[PDB]
Amino acid sequence: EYDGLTTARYDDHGFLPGREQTSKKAAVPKGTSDYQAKWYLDDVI
Amino acid sequence: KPAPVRTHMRNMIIVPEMIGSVVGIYNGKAFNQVEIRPEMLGHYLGEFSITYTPVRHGRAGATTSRFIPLK
Amino acid sequence: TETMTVLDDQYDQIINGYENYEEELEEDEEQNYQPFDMSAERSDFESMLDDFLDN
Amino acid sequence: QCRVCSSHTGLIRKYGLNICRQCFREK
Amino acid sequence: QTAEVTIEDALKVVLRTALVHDGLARGLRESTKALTRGEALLVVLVSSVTEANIIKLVEGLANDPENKVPLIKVADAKQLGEWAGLGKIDREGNARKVVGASVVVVKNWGAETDELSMIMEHFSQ
Amino acid sequence: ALPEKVIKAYTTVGSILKTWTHGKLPKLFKVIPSLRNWQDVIYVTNPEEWSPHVVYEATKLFVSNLTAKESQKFINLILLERFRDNIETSEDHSLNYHIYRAVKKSLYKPSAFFKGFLFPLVETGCNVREATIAGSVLAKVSVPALHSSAALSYLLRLPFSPPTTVFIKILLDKKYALPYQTVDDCVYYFMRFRILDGSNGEDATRVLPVIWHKAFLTFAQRYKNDITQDQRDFLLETVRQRGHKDIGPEIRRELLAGASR
RNA sequence: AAACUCACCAGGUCCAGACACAAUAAGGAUUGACAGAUUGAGAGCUCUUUCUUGAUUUUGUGGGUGGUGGUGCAUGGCCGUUC
């Protein structure tokens, strides 16, 4: 199944799969570079 | 709401007189929109910066991108 | 086939001035051996200078 | 250095003598 | 302004032969405008007129002899264009073709200081 | 002996324009050539020891501002010790930014190029490769052919040098005609080896590296007609006593075939 | 350790065609001691809008003169190094 995976068929000695567990949080104040977005209003629940 | 006029330093001090205008301010690249009020008193415009994709001590997921998959 | 072809024998006569370059350098130098002025450097020369000592 | 090497580590700007910390026992 | 005979023997023998120097500046856009903006101290003209739309208003400085005002004329039309820079720079090995002009505006004289400026004060008697 | 109104302008200049970054500049260093005393100009230039910006664009102090006699600017002597710097004053001998940005486009009046701020080259000491470097000067900005027969009538009267024949290489594809007081200058070049009983002298063996094979090649290029015709076998001692194999038959044709200029 | 140091960064432009001939080449090609617009995140620079210009040089181009690309390949002494 083409989009229901985590890793291509390279098991058969290679990768441990890098999991990207998406847990997004909002970016409230104004003005954003590449950096400061994810450390704006982190309500760490 | 006025326009986000840009300003690109880290040791410059704003004086409170100007209730009702907007200036975009240096955060490393971009220009944080500030509706300028007497709600900042002698502190840096370039203090608006914590410039990193955050320090991974609780979720260390980008450290997993530097390790070794191996043939 | 240069034939006159003005002015190849001189090339407007700045052609002998490389061997005796300090002999055609005196072809303009003698006229303006000049001493110092305060009024002929510029006309208002006490007005167009003081832009320096105060950064 | 003095021109008989490609010396790139432990470089010297001190005191014009161009002799390394690793070159007190060579140079 | 234009050139006499013994300035024919100045211009043809020196400047029109000065094929490397060509210290001249040639009417479709600017020499009656050189009677307007004020950047013409020497003019040298043409009288084999057939390129002369402005020259018929430059020839206000041909048939009105300030007296530096000399006026007697020379013939050849495409002098700078056929020899000396506005076109043919037919010289020691060249063969070019660009359409040229007929109205010299000399401002500045190099090493040829007063061999070229004989058009100053010698006609209006 | 000068008043202290003018003496007190050019001593503490090393406080403002040492670090030239931005702003609107003060007005007591640009006024040095505005002084009518230009004994107080060319020596108060501070010629050779600057920090920021100087080899290509913007040094034009007397090139096309004023005439072409006094500062006729460029290639030997007065700024030689800075012209000899950044090919010889590092162990890698490479180029950088203080030796890049503000001289070499002085050439807009190239009649102001051949006497007066640097020029008098091949008379009083010059190494092999300083009109090769100035071959980049004479081959990235324009060159006249008015000076080409001023750099063929003149350069061969002098003691001998490789930069002279480098000028020959840069300046005989101009293909503009030879004055006949000039052509005898380049040819007295290979004969003096044997004695008949012309009988010759002691100055026997002239040899130089690769631009000598590229530059006598320039006086052996294309023509046949406009030399003094006796000078053929004067230059055929490249096949006779210095015989060549690889690019040999592609040399000898300044004197053989083509119709001249 | 301060911006430089200091080997890196968030955004801009001063500047590349010489050598030949080909379009215009001196009616402005492209030059400059200057007056403004000048600002891209803070600059000197340019000359369309005073006028030096001085024959010279502008460009779609390629041999490559330009090895101020030498990493050099060793060759020639000379001394860290190896003895």
Domain ranges of chain F: 1-261
Positions in chain G where some atom is under 7 Å from a protein CB = 6, 10-11, 14-28, 30-34, 41-46, 50-58, 63, 65-72, 78-81
What the block records as the tokens of F100 is: 């890049």
Query: What is the bridge-based pairing of β-strands B21-26 and B31-36?
Result: antiparallel
Three-class DSSP labels, chain A: CCCCCCCCCCCCCCCCCCCCCCCCCCCCCCCCCCCHHHHCCCCCC
Report chain A's terminal Cα–Cα distance, integer Å.
34
CA dihedral E59, E61, E65, E70 (to 10 degrees): -110
Report which residue type is found at F250. E
Q: In the 8-state DSSP scheme, what is residue E105?
A: E
Interior angle at CA E67, CA E79 and CA E33, nearest 5? 50
Interface of A with B in 4-43 (CB under 8 A): 13-16, 18-21, 23, 29-36, 38-39, 42
Residues in chain C closer than 8 A to E112 (CB atoms): 7, 12
Residues in chain B closer than 8 A to A38 (CB atoms): 53-54
Chain breaks in chain B (C to N over 2.5 A) after: 8
Between CA A24 and CA A14 the distance in angstroms is 30
Measured on CA atoms in the order F100, F106, F111, F113, is the torsion positive or negative? negative
- For residue C7, whether the previous peptide bond is cis, meaning omega lies within 30 degrees of 0, is yes
E20 near F CB under 8 A: yes
Contacts of residues E96-100 at CB distance under 8 Å and 24 or more positions apart, as own/partner, are E99/E51, E100/E26
Compare CB distances from E110 to C4, C6, C12 and report the shortest one's residue. Answer: C12
- Determine the length of chain A: 45
Nearest nucleotide, CA E93 to C1': G21
Between CA D3 and CA F200 the distance in angstroms is 46
Chain breaks in chain A (C to N over 2.5 A) after: 12
Q: How far is CA B58 from CA A40, A44, F159, in A?
A: 16, 11, 80
Q: How far is CA F50 from CA E102, F44, F54, F172, in A?
A: 50, 13, 8, 37
Three-state SS for B44? strand
Determine contact, residues E97/E78, Cβ cutoff 8 Å. no
Nearest to B37 by CA among B8, B2, B6: B2
Where do we find the tokens 């060159």?
Answer: F143
The half-sphere exposure of F76 on its side-chain side, counting CA atoms within 13 A, is 17
Three-state SS for B13? strand
The CA–C1' separation of F141 and G17, in angstroms, is 9
D9 Cβ contact list (under 8 Å, min separation 6): D22
Between CA F29 and CA F10 the distance in angstroms is 7
Compare CB distances from F179 to C9, C14, C17 and report the shortest one's residue. Answer: C9
Nearest to F31 by CA among F9, F8, F49: F9
Chain breaks in chain F (C to N over 2.5 A) after: 197
Comparing every residue's Cα with the C1' atom of nucleotide G32, the nearest one is F65
Compare CB distances from E111 to C5, C8, C12 and report the shortest one's residue. Answer: C12
Residues in chain B closer than 8 A to A35 (CB atoms): 28, 50-53
- Determine the length of chain D: 27
DSSP secondary structure of D1-27: --SSS---SS---STTT---STTTTT-
Determine contact, residues E45/E62, Cβ cutoff 8 Å. yes
Nearest to F231 by CA among F188, F261, F202: F188
Chains that touch E (3 or more CB pairs under 8 A): C, F
Residues in chain F closer than 8 A to E113 (CB atoms): none
Determine contact, residues E104/E92, Cβ cutoff 8 Å. no
Please name the method used to determine this structure. Answer: cryo-EM
What the block records as the tokens of E68 is: 């530096």
F19 Cβ contact list (under 8 Å, min separation 6): F51
Nearest to B24 by CA among B51, B2, B42, B41: B2
Q: Could you give the number of structural domains in chain E? A: 1
Nearest to E110 by CA among F72, F223, B23: F72
Contact F5 C46 (CB under 8 A): yes
Contacts of residues E27-33 at CB distance under 8 Å and 24 or more positions apart, as own/partner, are E27/E51, E27/E52, E27/E53, E27/E54, E27/E55, E27/E57, E27/E58, E27/E101, E27/E102, E27/E103, E28/E53, E28/E54, E28/E101, E29/E54, E30/E54, E30/E105, E31/E55, E31/E58, E31/E103, E31/E105, E32/E57, E32/E58, E32/E60
Which helix (H) or strand (E) segment holds residue E60: the answer is none
Determine contact, residues E78/E11, Cβ cutoff 8 Å. no
Between CA F258 and CA E45 the distance in angstroms is 41
Binding site listing of D for Zn(2+): 2, 5, 20, 23
Three-state SS for F4? helix
Identify the domain containing residue E12 by its residue range: 1-125
A19 Cβ contact list (under 8 Å, min separation 6): A6, B61, B64
